[PDB]
From a paper:
Since late 2022, XBB* variants, especially XBB.1.5 and other XBB derivatives with a proline on residue 486 (486P) on the receptor-binding domain (RBD) of the virus Spike glycoprotein (S) started to dominate, which demonstrated enhanced binding to human ACE2 while maintaining extremely strong capability of evading humoral immunity. Interestingly, L455 and F456 are two adjacent residues on the receptor-binding motif (RBM) of SARS-CoV-2 RBD, and the variant is just the “flipping” of the two residues, L455-F456 to F455-L456, also known as the “FLip” mutant. These two sites are also located on a critical epitope that targeted by the public IGHV3-53/3-66 Class 1 NAbs. L455F caused strong affinity reduction on XBB.1.5, but significantly improved the hACE2-binding affinity of XBB.1.5+F456L. Both L455 and F456 are on the core of the RBD-hACE2 interface, forming a compact conformation with D30 and K31 on ACE2.
Furthermore, multiple independent XBB lineages with both F456L and L455F are growing rapidly in different countries, such as XBB.1.5.70/GK.* in Brazil, the United States, and Canada, and HK.3 (EG.5.1.1.3) in China. To elucidate the disparities in binding affinity between XBB.1.5, XBB.1.5+F456L, and XBB.1.5+L455F+F456L (“FLip”) spike proteins with ACE2, we determined the structures of these three spike proteins individually in complex with hACE2 to interrogate the conformational change on their RBD-ACE2 binding interface. As we expected, all three spike trimers mainly showed two ‘RBD-open’ and one ‘RBD-closed’ conformations with one or two ACE2 bound. Consistent with DMS results, L455F significantly dampens hACE2-binding affinity of XBB.1.5 RBD, and F456L also slightly weakens the binding to hACE2. Surprisingly, although neither of the two mutations increases hACE2 affinity alone, their combination XBB.1.5+L455F+F456L exhibits significantly higher affinity than XBB.1.5. In contrast, “FLip” not only rescues the accelerated dissociation, but also facilitates association, synergistically improving the receptor binding at both thermodynamic and kinetic levels. Our structural analyses reveal that “FLip” mediates substantial conformation change on the RBD-hACE2 binding interface, which involves the remodeling of not only 455/456, but also Q493 on RBD and H34 on hACE2. Above all, the flip of L455 and F456 lead to synergistic effect of residues around and reorganize the interface between “FLip” RBD and ACE2 so that enhanced binding affinity can be obtained.
Residue numbers in the entry:
A (entry chain C): 733 to 823, 845 to 1074
B (entry chain B): 538 to 614, 629 to 671, 686 to 732
C (entry chain B): 928 to 1136
């Protein structure tokens, strides 16, 4: 708010603000613009298609235990247990809610976000890339791995002779990445630092509420009490100008971080477009090694892309002609 | 006001341990959210008066003149005085001037937290609808092949410049 | 025949530049309207202060007026800086899109159009550009039965470019994304391995001249 931040219930401070005028309106239009732009990033990072699907009931998927990515029916927030553990690892609401630090509630719930992620995962897993271009065209899953192998220039007979070992390796990889996300907190850091960075930004904001701009007190009402308005205004203008420039610097820091996270969100949406809806040949852009699969998982203000990739293991040199 | 310093906000009964000569339970925001009664050994939680935050939801002037208004972060579970048609209690806040239907429709005008409103011969509100839901059956041999092959065109817009100027 | 009537229908298309134009306009309006303002001054006009008051104590209003004007123009120039940065990034993306979608056929899915991209055509605009992407979309489909392995003479065979299709009346092989019902011939399939390691195995015949 313009007034009740920079003033109390003293309308003379608002009168001096109206003497200055219209500078807080620029901050208001800036914050509304960055808020609706963040909402735009959110709605065009996940809601690629309005045609929402759901999973088939049975899992005959070639011995692929997809239980960690499948939405758990026991939990009312029917999301993947991976996402449940991610929410558990993520760590200040009501005290900030009534001080002019008016947090805007998110227009998109985590339930519908998880629903969209589940829908796109189901569409990829039952149709491949066919739903990405146009209508959803279902395909057999071994057909999907065969075409994935042909995407990286690999013939399909080797897949159809060691798909059992491929399934066992994939299940082991799923178990080890489940342990790995629970192993170190470094994976959570790229979102935790953002959350606590916004928290300390608002914290130094509320500290600079109690900042002395050369007056007797940070509060103005006692200054208005001990001295007449012929006297106190020469302090009042200095305090309100200091609060105004502090707000401008805070808004500037807000918008530069908004631009940075906007570029990050654009890159994330690009990777969702490329790595998830198809097999890109951009090396290390869809993960290191030859990219095969990629699944996204939701997170508070974020998304984790897991990537299933080929690496060679055993080799031998031979004479070449 | 109590012993010098003052405050503004509603007062409830605190339920936390206080020390001898303990008078201020100020948090990391340095706000007097808890105070000791200067008469008896009674403890007070201090929570400030709730602000508003007012937005108006209305279609076009050529469209209609019926409006609705949201006060965000208002726990009506009130302070509305002159009420309108009906009251609803979104997680965003307290909304009047509209009614909530039991079906979900397209989010042409978003209100927030999955709540979206529109115009029917009346202003209506609903939960956000995900879209058309269908599941394609999967089998060990089920495959789909397209038959007709059409051509579409898409238009996109990208900025280039702004007005170069000097002062 | 769509796109002209598509563009004259709604102003939401060019609104993505109209907002920038009017935002620059209202920014300049704010800068020219902040001349009439109170930076602690008795009047918002300089030579009126210099006329109605003596110099040597008038500068205590002139300096705060100066600081207010400098703060206003500094905020203006920083906001111009951030807009210039983001529009430069978007224009670099536009130049990349012109370098890929117009000068070739990129494989970046849903980047040079929607669906399988074929063509791209640029058209200029005041401080802007629009791209026309001609793409392919499938219209409607039909369901079929799949079997990868065809074992002839006890020998496994896999179709090379396409998959086996079971019409029920007859049994063919087609391409990967569309339908071309084609008879079994040796050039369509590669031969490898035994017939005891695969799922979806089926028995059928092959042609040789």
């Amino acid at each position: 708010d313009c007034t009740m931040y920079i003033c109390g219930d003293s309308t003379e401070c608002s009168n001096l603000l109206l003497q200055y005028g219209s500078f807080c309106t620029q901050l208001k239009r800036a914050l509304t613009g960055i808020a609706v732009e963040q909402d735009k990033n959110t709605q065009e990072v996940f809601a690629q298609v309005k045609q929402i699907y759901k999973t088939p009931p049975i899992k005959y998927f070639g011995g692929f235990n997809f239980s960690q990515i499948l939405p758990d029916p026991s939990k009312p927030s029917k999301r993947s247990p991976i996402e449940d553990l991610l929410f558990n690892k993520v760590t200040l609401i009501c005290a900030q809610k009534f001080n002019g630090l008016t947090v805007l509630p998110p227009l998109l719930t985590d339930e519908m976000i998880a629903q969209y992620t589940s829908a796109l995962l189901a569409g990829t897993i039952t149709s491949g890339w066919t739903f990405g271009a146009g209508p959803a065209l279902q395909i057999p899953f071994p057909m999907q791995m065969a075409y994935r192998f042909n995407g990286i220039g690999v013939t399909q007979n080797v897949l159809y002779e060691n798909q059992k070992l491929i399934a066992n390796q994939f299940n082991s990889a799923i178990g080890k990445i489940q342990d790995s996300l629970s192993s170190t907190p470094s994976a959570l850091g790229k979102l935790q630092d953002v959350v606590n960075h916004n928290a300390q930004a608002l914290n130094t904001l509320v500290k600079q509420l109690s900042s002395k701009f050369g007056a007797i007190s940070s509060v103005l009402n006692d200054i208005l009490s001990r001295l007449d308005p012929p006297e106190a205004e020469v302090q009042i203008d200095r305090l309100i100008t200091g609060r105004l420039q502090s707000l401008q610097t805070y808004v500037t820091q807000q918008l530069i971080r908004a631009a940075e996270i906007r570029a990050s969100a654009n890159l994330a949406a690009t990777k969702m477009s490329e790595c998830v809806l198809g097999q890109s040949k951009r090396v290390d852009f869809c993960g290191k090694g030859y990219h095969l699969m990629s699944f996204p998982q939701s997170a508070p203000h974020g998304v984790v892309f897991l990537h299933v990739t080929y690496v060679p293991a055993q080799e031998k040199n031979f004479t070449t002609a | 006001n109590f012993n010098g310093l003052t405050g503004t906000g509603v007062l409830t009964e605190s339920n936390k341990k206080f020390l001898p000569f303990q008078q201020f339970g100020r948090d990391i925001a340095d706000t007097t959210d808890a105070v000791r009664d200067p008469q008896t050994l009674e403890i007070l939680d201090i929570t400030p008066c709730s602000f508003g935050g007012v937005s108006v939801i209305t279609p076009g002037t050529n469209t209609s003149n019926q409006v609705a208004v949201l006060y965000q972060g208002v726990n009506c579970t009130w302070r509305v005085y002159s009420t309108g048609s009906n009251v609803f209690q979104t997680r965003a806040g307290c909304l009047i001037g509209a009614e909530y239907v039991n079906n979900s429709y397209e989010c042409d005008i978003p209100i927030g937290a999955g709540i979206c409103a529109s115009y029917q011969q009346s202003i209506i509100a609903y939960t956000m609808s995900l879209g058309a839901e269908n599941s394609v059956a999967y089998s060990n041999n089920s495959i789909a092949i397209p038959t007709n092959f059409t051509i579409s065109v898409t238009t996109e817009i990208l900025p280039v410049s702004m007005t170069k100027t000097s002062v | 025949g769509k796109i002209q009537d598509s563009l004259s229908s709604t102003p939401s298309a060019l609104g993505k530049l109209q907002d920038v134009v009017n935002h620059n306009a209202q920014a300049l309006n704010t800068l020219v309207k902040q001349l009439s303002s109170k930076f602690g001054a008795i009047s918002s006009v300089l030579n009126d202060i210099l006329s109605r008051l003596d110099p040597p104590e008038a500068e205590v209003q002139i300096d705060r007026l100066i600081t207010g004007r400098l703060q206003s123009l500094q905020t203006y120039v920083t906001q111009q800086l951030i807009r210039a940065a983001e529009i430069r990034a978007s224009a670099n993306l536009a130049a990349t899109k012109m370098s890929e979608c117009v000068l070739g056929q990129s494989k970046r899915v849903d980047f040079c159009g929607k669906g399988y991209h074929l063509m791209s055509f640029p058209q200029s605009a005041p401080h802007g550009v629009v791209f026309l992407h001609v793409t392919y979309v499938p219209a409607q489909e039909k369901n079929f039965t799949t079997a990868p392995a065809i074992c002839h003479d006890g020998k496994a065979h896999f179709p090379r470019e396409g998959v086996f299709v079971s019409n029920g009346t007859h049994w063919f092989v087609t391409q990967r994304n569309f339908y071309e019902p084609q008879i079994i011939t040796t050039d369509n399939t590669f031969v490898s391995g035994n017939c005891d390691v695969v799922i979806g195995i089926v028995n059928n015949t092959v042609y040789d001249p």
